[PDB]
Short mmCIF file of C-alpha atoms and ligand atoms in Angstrom, two decimals:
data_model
loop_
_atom_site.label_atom_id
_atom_site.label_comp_id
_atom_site.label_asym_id
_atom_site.label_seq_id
_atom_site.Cartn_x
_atom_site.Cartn_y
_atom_site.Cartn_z
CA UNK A 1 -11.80 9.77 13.02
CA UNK A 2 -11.10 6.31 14.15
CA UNK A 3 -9.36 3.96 11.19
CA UNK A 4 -10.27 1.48 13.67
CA UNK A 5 -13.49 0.85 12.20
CA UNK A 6 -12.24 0.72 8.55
CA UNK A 7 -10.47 -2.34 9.56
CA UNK A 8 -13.55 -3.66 11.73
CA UNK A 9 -15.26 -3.04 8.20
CA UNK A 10 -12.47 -4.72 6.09
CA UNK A 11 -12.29 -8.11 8.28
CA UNK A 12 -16.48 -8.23 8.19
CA UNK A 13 -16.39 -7.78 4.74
CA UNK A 14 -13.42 -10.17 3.81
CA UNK A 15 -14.78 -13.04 5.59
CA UNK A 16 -18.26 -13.02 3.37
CA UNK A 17 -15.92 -13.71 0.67
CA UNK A 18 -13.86 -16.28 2.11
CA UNK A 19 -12.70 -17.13 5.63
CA UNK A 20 -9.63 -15.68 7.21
CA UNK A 21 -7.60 -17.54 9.34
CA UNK A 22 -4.51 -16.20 11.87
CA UNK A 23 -1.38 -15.23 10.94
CA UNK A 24 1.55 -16.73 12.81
CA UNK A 25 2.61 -13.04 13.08
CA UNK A 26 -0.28 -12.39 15.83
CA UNK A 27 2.28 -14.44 18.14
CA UNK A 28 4.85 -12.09 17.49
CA UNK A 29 3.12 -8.25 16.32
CA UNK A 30 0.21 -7.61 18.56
CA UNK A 31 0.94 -4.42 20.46
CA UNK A 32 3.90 -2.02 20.64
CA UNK A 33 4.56 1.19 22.54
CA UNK A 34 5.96 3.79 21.64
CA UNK A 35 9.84 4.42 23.67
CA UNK A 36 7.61 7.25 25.72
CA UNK A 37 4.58 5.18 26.67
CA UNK A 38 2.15 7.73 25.51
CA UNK A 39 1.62 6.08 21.47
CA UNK A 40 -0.21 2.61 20.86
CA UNK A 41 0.53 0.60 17.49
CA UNK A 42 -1.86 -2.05 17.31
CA UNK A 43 -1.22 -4.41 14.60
CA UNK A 44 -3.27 -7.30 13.15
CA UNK A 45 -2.56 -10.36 10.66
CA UNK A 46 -4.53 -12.86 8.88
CA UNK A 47 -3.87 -14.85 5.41
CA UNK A 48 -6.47 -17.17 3.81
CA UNK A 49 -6.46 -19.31 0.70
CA UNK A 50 -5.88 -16.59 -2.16
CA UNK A 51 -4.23 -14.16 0.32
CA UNK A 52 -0.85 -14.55 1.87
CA UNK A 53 -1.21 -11.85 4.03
CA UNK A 54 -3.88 -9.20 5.07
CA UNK A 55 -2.45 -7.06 7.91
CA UNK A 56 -3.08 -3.66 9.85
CA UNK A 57 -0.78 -1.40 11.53
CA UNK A 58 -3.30 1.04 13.41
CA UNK A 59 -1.47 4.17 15.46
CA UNK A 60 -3.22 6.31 17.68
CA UNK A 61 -1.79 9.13 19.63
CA UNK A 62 -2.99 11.30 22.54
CA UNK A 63 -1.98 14.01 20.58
CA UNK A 64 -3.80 13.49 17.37
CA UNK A 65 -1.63 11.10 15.15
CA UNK A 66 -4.19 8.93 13.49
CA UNK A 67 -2.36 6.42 11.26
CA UNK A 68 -3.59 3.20 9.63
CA UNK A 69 -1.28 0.92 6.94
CA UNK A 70 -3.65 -1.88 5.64
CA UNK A 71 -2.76 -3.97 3.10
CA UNK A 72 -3.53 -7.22 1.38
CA UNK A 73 -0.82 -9.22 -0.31
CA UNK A 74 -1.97 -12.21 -2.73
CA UNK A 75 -0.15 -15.67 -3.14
CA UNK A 76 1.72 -15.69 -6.08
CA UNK A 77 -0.31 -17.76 -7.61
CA UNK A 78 -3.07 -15.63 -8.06
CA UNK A 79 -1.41 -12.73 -9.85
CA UNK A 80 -4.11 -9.82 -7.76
CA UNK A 81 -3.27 -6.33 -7.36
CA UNK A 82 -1.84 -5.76 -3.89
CA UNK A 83 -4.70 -3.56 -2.04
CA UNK A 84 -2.99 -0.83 -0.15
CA UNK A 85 -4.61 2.04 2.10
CA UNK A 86 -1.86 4.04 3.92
CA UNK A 87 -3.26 7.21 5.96
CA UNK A 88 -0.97 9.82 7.77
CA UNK A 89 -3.57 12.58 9.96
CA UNK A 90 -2.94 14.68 12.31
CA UNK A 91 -5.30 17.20 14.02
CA UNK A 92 -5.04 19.40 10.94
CA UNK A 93 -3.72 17.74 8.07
CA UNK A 94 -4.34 13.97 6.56
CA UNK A 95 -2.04 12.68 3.69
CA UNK A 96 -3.26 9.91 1.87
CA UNK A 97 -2.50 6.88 -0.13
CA UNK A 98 -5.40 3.83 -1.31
CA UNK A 99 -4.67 2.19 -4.19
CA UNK A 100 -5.37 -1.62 -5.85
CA UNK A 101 -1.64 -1.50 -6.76
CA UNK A 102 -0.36 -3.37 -10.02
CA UNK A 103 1.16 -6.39 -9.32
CA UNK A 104 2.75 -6.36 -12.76
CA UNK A 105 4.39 -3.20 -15.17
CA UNK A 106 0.52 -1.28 -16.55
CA UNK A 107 2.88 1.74 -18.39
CA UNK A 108 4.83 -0.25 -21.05
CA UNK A 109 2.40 -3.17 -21.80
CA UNK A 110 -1.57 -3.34 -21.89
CA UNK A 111 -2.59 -7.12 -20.56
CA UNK A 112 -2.85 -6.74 -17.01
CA UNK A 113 -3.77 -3.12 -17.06
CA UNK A 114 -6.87 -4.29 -18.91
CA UNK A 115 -7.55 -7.40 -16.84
CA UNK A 116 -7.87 -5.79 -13.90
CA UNK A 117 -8.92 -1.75 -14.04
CA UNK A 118 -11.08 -1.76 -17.26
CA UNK A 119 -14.26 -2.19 -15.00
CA UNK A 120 -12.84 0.49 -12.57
CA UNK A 121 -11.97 3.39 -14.40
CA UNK A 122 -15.36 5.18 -13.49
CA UNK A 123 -15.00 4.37 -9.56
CA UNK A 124 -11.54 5.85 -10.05
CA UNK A 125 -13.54 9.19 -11.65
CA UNK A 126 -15.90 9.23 -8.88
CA UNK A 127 -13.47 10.04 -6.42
CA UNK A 128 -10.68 11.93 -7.91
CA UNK A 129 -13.12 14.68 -8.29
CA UNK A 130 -13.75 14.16 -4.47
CA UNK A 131 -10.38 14.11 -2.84
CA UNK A 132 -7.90 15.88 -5.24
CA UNK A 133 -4.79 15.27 -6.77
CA UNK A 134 -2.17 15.25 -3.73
CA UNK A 135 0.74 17.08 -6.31
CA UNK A 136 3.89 16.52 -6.98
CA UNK A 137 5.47 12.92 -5.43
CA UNK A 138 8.24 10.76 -5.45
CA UNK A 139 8.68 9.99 -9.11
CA UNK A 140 9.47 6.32 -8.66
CA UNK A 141 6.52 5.70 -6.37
CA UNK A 142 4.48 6.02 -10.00
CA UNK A 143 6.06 2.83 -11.19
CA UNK A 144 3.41 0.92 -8.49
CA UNK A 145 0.14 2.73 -8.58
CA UNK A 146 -3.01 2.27 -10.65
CA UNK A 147 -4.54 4.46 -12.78
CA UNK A 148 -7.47 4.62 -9.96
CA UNK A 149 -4.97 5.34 -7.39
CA UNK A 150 -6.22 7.98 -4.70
CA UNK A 151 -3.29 10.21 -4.04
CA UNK A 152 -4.16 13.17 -2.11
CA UNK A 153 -4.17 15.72 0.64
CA UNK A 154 -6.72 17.17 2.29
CA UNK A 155 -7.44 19.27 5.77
CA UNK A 156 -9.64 17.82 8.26
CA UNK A 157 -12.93 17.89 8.38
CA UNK A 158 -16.28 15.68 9.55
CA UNK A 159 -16.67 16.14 5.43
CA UNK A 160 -13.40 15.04 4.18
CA UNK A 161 -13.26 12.06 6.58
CA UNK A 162 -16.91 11.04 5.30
CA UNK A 163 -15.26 10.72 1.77
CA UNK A 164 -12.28 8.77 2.61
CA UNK A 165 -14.27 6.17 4.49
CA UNK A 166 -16.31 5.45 1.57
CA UNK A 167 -13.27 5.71 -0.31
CA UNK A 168 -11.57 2.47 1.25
CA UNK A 169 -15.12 0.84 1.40
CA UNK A 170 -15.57 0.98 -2.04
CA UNK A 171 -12.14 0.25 -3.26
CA UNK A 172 -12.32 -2.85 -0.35
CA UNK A 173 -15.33 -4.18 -2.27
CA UNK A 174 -14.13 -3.84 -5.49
CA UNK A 175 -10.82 -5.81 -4.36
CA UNK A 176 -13.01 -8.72 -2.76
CA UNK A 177 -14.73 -8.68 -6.64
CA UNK A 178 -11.30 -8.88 -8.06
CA UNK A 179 -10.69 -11.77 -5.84
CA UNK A 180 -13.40 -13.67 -6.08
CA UNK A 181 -12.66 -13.99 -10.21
CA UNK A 182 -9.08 -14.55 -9.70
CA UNK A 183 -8.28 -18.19 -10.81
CA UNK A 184 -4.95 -20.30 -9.34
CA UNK A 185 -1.76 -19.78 -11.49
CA UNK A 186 -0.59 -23.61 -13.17
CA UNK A 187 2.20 -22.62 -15.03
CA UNK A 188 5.51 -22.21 -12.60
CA UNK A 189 7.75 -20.10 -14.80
CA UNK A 190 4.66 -17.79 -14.14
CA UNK A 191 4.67 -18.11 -10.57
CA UNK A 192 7.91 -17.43 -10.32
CA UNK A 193 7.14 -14.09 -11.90
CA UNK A 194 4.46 -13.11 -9.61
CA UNK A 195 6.50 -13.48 -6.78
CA UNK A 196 9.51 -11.90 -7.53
CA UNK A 197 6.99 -8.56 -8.96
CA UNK A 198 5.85 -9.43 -5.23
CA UNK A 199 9.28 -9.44 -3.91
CA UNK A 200 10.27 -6.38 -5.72
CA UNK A 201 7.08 -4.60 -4.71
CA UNK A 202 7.92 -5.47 -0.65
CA UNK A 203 11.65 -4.61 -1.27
CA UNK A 204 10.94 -0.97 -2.51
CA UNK A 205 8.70 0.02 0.28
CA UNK A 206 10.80 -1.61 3.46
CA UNK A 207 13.35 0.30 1.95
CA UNK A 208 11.61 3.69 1.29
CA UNK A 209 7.92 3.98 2.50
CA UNK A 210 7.75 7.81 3.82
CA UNK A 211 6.51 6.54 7.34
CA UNK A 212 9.85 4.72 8.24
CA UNK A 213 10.52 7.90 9.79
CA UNK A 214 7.87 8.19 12.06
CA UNK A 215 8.12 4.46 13.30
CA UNK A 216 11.60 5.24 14.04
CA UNK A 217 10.88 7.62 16.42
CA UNK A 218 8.15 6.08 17.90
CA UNK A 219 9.77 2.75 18.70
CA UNK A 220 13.61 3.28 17.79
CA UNK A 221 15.65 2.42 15.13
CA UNK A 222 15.78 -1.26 15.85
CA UNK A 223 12.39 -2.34 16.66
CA UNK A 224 11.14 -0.22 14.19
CA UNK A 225 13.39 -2.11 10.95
CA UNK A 226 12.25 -5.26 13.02
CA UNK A 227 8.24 -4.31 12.29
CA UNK A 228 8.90 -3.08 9.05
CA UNK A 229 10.68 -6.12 7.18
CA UNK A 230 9.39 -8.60 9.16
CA UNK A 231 5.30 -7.82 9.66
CA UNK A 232 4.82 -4.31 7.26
CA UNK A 233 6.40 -6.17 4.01
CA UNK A 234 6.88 -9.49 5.72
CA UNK A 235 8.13 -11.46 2.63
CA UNK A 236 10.73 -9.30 1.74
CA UNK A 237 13.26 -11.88 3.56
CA UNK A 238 11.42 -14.57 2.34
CA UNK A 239 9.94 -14.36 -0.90
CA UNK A 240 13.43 -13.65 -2.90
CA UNK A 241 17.19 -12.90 -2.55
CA UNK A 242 17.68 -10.22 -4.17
CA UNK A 243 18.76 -6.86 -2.36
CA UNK A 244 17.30 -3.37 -2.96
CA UNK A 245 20.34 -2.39 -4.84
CA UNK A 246 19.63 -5.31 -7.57
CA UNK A 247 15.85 -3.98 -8.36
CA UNK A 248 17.08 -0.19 -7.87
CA UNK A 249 20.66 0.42 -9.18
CA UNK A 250 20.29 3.68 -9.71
CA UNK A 251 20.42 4.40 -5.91
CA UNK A 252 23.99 2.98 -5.44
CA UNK A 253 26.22 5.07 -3.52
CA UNK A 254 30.03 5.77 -4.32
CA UNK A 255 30.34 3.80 -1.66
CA UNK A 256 27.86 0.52 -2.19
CA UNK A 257 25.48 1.86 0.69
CA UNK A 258 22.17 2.74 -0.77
CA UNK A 259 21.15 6.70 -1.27
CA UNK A 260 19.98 8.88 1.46
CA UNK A 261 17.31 10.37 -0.92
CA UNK A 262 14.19 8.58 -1.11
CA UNK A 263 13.81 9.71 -4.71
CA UNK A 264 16.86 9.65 -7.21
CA UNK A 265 14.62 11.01 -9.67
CA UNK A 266 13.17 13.94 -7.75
CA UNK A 267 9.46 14.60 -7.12
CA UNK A 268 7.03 15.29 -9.92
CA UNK A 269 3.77 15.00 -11.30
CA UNK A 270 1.99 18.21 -10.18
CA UNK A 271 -1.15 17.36 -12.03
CA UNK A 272 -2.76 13.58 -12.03
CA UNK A 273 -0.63 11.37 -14.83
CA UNK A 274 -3.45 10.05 -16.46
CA UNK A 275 -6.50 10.93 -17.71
CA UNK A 276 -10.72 10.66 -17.11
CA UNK A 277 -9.90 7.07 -19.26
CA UNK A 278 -7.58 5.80 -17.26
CA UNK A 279 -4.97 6.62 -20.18
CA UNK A 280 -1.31 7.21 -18.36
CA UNK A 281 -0.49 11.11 -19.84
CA UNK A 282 2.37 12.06 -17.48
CA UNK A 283 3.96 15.64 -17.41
CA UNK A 284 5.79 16.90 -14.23
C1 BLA B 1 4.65 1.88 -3.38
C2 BLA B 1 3.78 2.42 -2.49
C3 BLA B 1 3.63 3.70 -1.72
C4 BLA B 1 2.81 4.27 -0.75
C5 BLA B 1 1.74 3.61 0.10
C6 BLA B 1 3.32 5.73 -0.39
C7 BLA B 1 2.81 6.79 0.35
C8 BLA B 1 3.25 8.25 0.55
N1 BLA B 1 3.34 8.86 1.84
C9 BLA B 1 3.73 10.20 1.70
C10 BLA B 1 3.96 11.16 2.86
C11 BLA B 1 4.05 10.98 4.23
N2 BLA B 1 3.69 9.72 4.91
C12 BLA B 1 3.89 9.90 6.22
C13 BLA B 1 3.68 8.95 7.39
C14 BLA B 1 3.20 7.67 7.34
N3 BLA B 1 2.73 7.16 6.11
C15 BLA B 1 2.28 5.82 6.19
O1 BLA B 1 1.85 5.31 5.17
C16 BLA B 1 2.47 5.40 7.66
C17 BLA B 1 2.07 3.98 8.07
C18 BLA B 1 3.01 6.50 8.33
C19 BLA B 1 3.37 6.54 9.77
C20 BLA B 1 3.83 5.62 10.64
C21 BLA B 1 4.42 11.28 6.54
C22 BLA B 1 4.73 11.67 7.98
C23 BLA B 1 4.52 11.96 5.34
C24 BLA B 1 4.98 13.38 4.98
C25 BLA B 1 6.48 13.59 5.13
C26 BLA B 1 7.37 12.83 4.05
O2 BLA B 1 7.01 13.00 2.89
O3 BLA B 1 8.27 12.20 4.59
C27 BLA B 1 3.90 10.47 0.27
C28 BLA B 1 4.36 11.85 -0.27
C29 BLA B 1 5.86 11.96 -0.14
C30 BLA B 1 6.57 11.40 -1.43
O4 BLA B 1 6.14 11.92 -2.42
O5 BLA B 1 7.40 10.57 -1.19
C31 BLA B 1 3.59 9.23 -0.44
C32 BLA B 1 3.58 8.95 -1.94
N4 BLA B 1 4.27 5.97 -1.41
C33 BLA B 1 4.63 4.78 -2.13
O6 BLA B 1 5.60 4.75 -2.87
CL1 CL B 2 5.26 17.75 2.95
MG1 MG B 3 7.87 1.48 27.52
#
């Protein structure tokens, strides 16, 4: 498939809600190859008055590699869940992350977990039964997904791919609906909040998103730290001072260098932590 048009669908769509302007990042992330000339990433940026930032990395390879990170990041005044589609296929295989992820803790307190994914709980049912469970996963990745969060892995097929595009489109739409009702923040002590959740949120995944990896040996080491702090999670220089180790201590090394292991907690959650409600029930 081509995740080209989801984001041809996701800018249409966006701009009947509002209207998108550029990001000063299209001056500086447009297009990047790969070190051996045969890999495009194509990458995309636009903020407008509640968002600030909606961006696309798209990757397509001549060897089927199909990968697209969208994501839409709100102003901290408008406290939104951060929309997040990140797909990893190959010719065979497609692993699979869309989420509207929780700006704010939904485990230990009920508020924002009711604002926000009350009215979604049954569009979350629709397509768990539809793309299943993806198994067991890095334990702390849990402490940023919804309890509509698509998690999953699935073999290709013309079938499969069907689903996942209405997938995003419906989760897009819903999104948009969650933005149009969001109302501007007044009080700054809450602000402040919202963006350093937001700063938190960008800090964990430049730090240990499972497709570092693959930019890294697409477009080396450097270039590829460049793209990720500075367009993927752009904010995570500006939007806050504190370091990884701060949020995360657990991952401090004897040393003070952060841990090699993406997960100091190991990988679990072989069934789907919460329930047909929306109710978080999490095993291992
Ligand atoms: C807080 C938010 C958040 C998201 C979105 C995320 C996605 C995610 N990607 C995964 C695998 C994977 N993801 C990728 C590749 C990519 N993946 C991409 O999203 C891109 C853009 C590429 C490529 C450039 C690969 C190659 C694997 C399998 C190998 C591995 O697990 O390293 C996994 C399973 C591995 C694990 O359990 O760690 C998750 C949960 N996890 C999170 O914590
Ligand atoms: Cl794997
Ligand atoms: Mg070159």
């Amino acid at each position: 498939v081509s995740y080209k048009k989801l984001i041809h669908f996701a800018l249409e769509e966006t701009n009947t809600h509002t209207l998108l302007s550029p990001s000063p990042l299209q001056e500086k992330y447009s297009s990047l190859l790969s070190m051996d000339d045969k890999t495009e990433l194509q990458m995309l940026s636009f903020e407008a008055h509640k968002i600030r930032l909606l961006r696309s990395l798209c990757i397509e390879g001549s060897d089927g590699m199909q990968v697209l990170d969208f994501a839409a990041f709100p102003k901290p005044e408008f406290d939104l869940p951060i929309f997040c589609a990140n797909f990893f296929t190959t010719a065979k295989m497609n692993i699979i992350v869309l989420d509207l992820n929780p700006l704010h803790d939904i485990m230990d307190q009920e508020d924002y977990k009711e604002k926000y994914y009350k009215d979604l709980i049954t569009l979350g049912l629709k397509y768990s039964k539809l793309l299943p469970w993806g198994g067991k996963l890095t334990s702390e990745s849990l402490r940023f997904f919804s309890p509509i969060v698509i998690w999953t892995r699935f073999s290709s097929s013309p079938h499969n791919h069907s689903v996942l595009f209405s997938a995003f489109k419906d989760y897009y739409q819903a999104w948009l609906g969650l933005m149009d009702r969001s109302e501007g923040e007044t009080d700054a002590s809450q602000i402040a909040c919202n963006c350093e959740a937001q700063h938190r949120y960008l800090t964990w995944r430049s730090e240990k998103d499972p497709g570092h990896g693959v930019l890294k040996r697409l477009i080396g080491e450097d270039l590829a730290k460049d793209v990720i702090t500075k367009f993927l999670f752009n904010g995570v220089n500006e939007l806050g001072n504190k370091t990884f180790l701060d949020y995360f201590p657990e991952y401090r090394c004897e040393d003070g260098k952060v841990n090699e292991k993406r997960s100091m907690i190991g990988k679990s959650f072989e069934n789907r932590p919460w329930n047909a409600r929306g109710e978080f029930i999490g095993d291992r």
